[PDB]
Amino acid sequence: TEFKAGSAKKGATLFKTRCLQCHTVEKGGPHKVGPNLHGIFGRHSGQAEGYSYTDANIKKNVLWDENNMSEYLTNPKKYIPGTKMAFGGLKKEKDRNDLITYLKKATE
Numbered sequence: 833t834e835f836k837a838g839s840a841k842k843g844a845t846l847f848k849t850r851c852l853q854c855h856t857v858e859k860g861g862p863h864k865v866g867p868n869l870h871g872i873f874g875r876h877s878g879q880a881e882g883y884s885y886t887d888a889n890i891k892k893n894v895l896w897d898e899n900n901m902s903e904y905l906t907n908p909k910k911y912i913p914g915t916k917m918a919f920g921g922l923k924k925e926k927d928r929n930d931l932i933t934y935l936k937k938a939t940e
């Protein structure tokens with residue numbers, strides 16, 4: 833119990849400001865730099881078909897829930913050294929919370 837739900841609305845704007853550049857959340861939404869994330873929760877890293885995920889991703893083989901997703905979010909390259917994810921992360925717990933709640937919601 834190390835993840836508390838923040839604001840959906842809050843999350844929706846970091847997502848825009850911080851993940852839209854390379855990602856879509858919507859089912860039937862496109863793969864871009866990074867892959868579309870619809871249905872990310874419960875799935876293991878590297879399973880979006882039509883996306884050329886680095887070796888690193890695949891082998892990591894992380895299960896996607898709110899928690900894993902918060903450390904990863906703290907420092908990706910650190911959670912998965914190898915990852916072509918060019919993102920330093922999100923330093924604050926609160927901001928993390930917010931977006932995941934956001935992610936929680938839309939990728940559904």
Ligand code: HEC
Nearest residue numbers: 850851854865866877878879885886889915916917918919
């Ligand atoms: C482009 C500059 C990106 C930004 C900004 C963000 N993401 Fe990303 N993401 C990107 C790539 C190229 C990849 C694949 C990495 C690889 O090594 O192949 C990823 C991957 C993810 C994943 C894991 C994918 C999976 O197994 O299905 C997740 C959960 C994810 N990205 C989420 C995410 C969020 C919430 C972001 C905003 C703060 C974000 N990423 C930024 C490309 C880019």
